[PDB]
């Protein structure tokens, strides 16, 4: 398809490289970083931590991350740009709606939210001219009317622009079938959609049937595991009780079923978070000191060790994300 | 002195004050992310500047914009329209009815620190300091509401800046708030129980005034009527007449509590936190905007025999005593 918009401008598909398809520099809420930077120690400290972390990912071979932080999760596109330039890693920014829409979003019609996603894709985010490269939607629980409205607006925005849609499916309730029904009712191609956090379930029948329809399957919280931290209830709620190897083996399972082309792999990492319990980044850092480099440093060799061909792993980490991100009407 | 979005001003410069107003009701960062929702940022500024100049021409010198972070306070917007309209604007910290998860997850200690940052250091990177703390409860009080009230009390006690509350729903919700504030050691004279004109339970208001609370009779033009085929109106507006609300002002004066009264419109010039184009419904019902209090309510009170000195006390002296950090 087309070139891809990043927070440093449009880049050629050939320059995307090894891509982490679901990441965050900072998880918060709109305007939060600007209003209370000292929550993160300082804006400067957060920038330093993110740049260091992204450089380590880069040394490990990562060339692009997709930051799927929305307006309501506190996307600060100036932060993303500063960090992208200093780490020299491409960052694709997002539009869409996560789990915490304010009333200003919850009161909107499907037409109005389609207009908001389009502005962020076609014109730019705020007054920056930086255009979103991906539409993020999030649902948890059983779907609400508002969730359906958001999915329809995302589908309509994707159809008008070619940019893909990524979903947050929480927590293991296997919501992809419910989401796909709505996407398809709007005429959206499954090839434009990633059903994210699919690694939260071990239901391979569910995963395979979505893959077979041409959905991308986001196996993208691989390092998250609270095993060993059972005394911390907040760790278990956020990271789950399944090992990173259990998650990673789903990648190999879908490969072995013939669906290598449908797999997107990431960490769903963060360098700062205020949307949850205080200091939770410290708990994450203790589980996975590799941060975003976890995928290339730990998961790729694990999968090779289990017999996955290197070409297959390159197709999953380079070719699939390029095919996914490249705008395609 | 009192902090405004243009810096500190002397108490004597505050003048006729509207103590509960909004330039724009939205959510944090919404104006910067979606200005076209309001036509443009420029269009909102022009509408707000004209409306503040109307209020100024009717005698208003200061408004207190009680928009918090989560209601979309944009202090650069406030500074721009304050400067262009030559109307002082006092900005707010606190928490309204739509806190994001980043606020809902915080401890009482953390929320106290946030409010203190906005009062003592400044809002965002602007150096503009909040001059009032807003808290909002709708319905029956929750654990999170109680936490915000205590953080507000503590921020008030550390800075001397007053607390304004949004009451709505459950009966006599000012009593719940008062009990919490008093448990923290906050003087009632630092607290305005807002939207008190939404009730006709005069004994409830007199009792709070008697304890030394300020009584915010501040939704007077939202009385509405004539919009029965507009459900969004009646739920946000109300089903009473503005004169009946205004009569509450005279009733508290007659009971001896003129010094406890604060009067305002609770107006705004743009809103995205409710139904689209709700601003049009508002502007159709009250085309005076923030000038409604000086153009309609003050004459009304005068006709009912309220003396000039009493009206000056309510509109100039009470807000100055309330806002001056103590
Ligand atoms: Zn997610
Ligand atoms: Zn995520
Ligand atoms: Zn209110
Ligand atoms: Zn208000």
Written overview of the protein:
The structure is a homodimer. The first copy, chain A, is α/β, with parallel strands linked by helices and 329 residues long. Chain A has a single domain (1-329), classed as Metal-dependent hydrolases (TIM Barrel). Chain A is built from 13 helices and 13 strands. The first copy, chain A, has helices at 32-35, 43-59, 77-87, 103-106, 110-123, 145-161, 176-185, 204-212, 233-239, 244-256, 280-287, 294-305, 310-325; strands at 4-6, 9-11, 19-23, 26-27, 64-67, 90-92, 94-97, 134-140, 165-170, 193-196, 216-219, 263-265, 272-273. In chain A, the strands form 4 sheets. The first copy, chain A, has a 6-stranded parallel sheet. In chain A, strands 3-5-6 form a 3-stranded parallel sheet. The first copy, chain A, has a two-stranded antiparallel sheet with strand order 1-2. In chain A, α8 links the parallel β10 and β11 (216-219). In chain A, α2 (43-59) crosses α3 (77-87) and α5 packs parallel to α6 (145-161). Chain A starts with a strand and ends with a helix. The interface between A and B is medium-sized, with 33 and 32 residues. The structure holds zinc ion (ZN) (4 copies). Chain B: Zn(2+) 2 binds at residues 134, 166, 195.
């Amino acid at each position: 398809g087309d070139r891809i918009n990043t927070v440093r401008g449009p880049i050629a598909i050939s320059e995307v490289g090894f891509t982490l398809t679901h990441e965050h520099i900072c998880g918060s809420s709109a305007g939060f970083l600007r209003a209370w930077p000292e929550f993160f120690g300082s804006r400067e400290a957060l920038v330093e931590k993110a740049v260091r972390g992204l450089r380590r990912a880069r040394a490990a071979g990562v060339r692009t991350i997709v930051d799927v932080t929305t307006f309501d999760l506190g996307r600060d596109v100036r932060l993303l740009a500063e960090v992208s330039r200093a780490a020299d890693v491409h960052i694709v920014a997002a539009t869409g709606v996560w789990l915490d829409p304010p009333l200003t979003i919850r009161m909107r019609s499907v037409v109005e939210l389609t207009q908001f996603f389009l502005r962020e894709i076609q014109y730019g985010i705020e007054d920056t001219g930086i255009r979103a490269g991906i539409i993020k939607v999030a649902i948890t629980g059983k779907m609400t009317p508002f969730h359906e409205l958001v999915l329809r607006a995302a589908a309509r925005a994707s159809l008008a622009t070619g940019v893909p849609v990524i979903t947050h499916t929480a927590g293991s309730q296997r919501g992809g079938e419910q989401q796909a029904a709505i996407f398809e009712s709007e005429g959206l191609s499954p090839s434009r959609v990633c059903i994210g956090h699919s690694d939260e379930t071990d239901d391979l029948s569910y995963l395979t049937a979505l893959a077979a329809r041409g959905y991308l399957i986001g196996l993208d919280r691989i390092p998250h595991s609270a095993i060993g931290l059972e005394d911390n209830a907040s760790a278990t709620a956020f990271m789950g009780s399944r090992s990173w190897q259990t998650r990673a083996l789903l990648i190999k399972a879908l490969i072995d079923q013939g669906y290598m082309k449908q797999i997107l792999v990431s960490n769903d990492w963060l360098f700062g978070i205020s949307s949850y319990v205080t200091n939770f980044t410290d708990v994450m850092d203790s589980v996975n000191p590799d941060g975003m480099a976890f995928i290339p440093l730990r998961v790729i060799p694990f999968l090779r060790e289990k017999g996955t061909p290197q070409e297959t792993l390159a197709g999953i980490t380079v070719t699939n994300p390029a095919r996914f991100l490249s705008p395609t009407l």
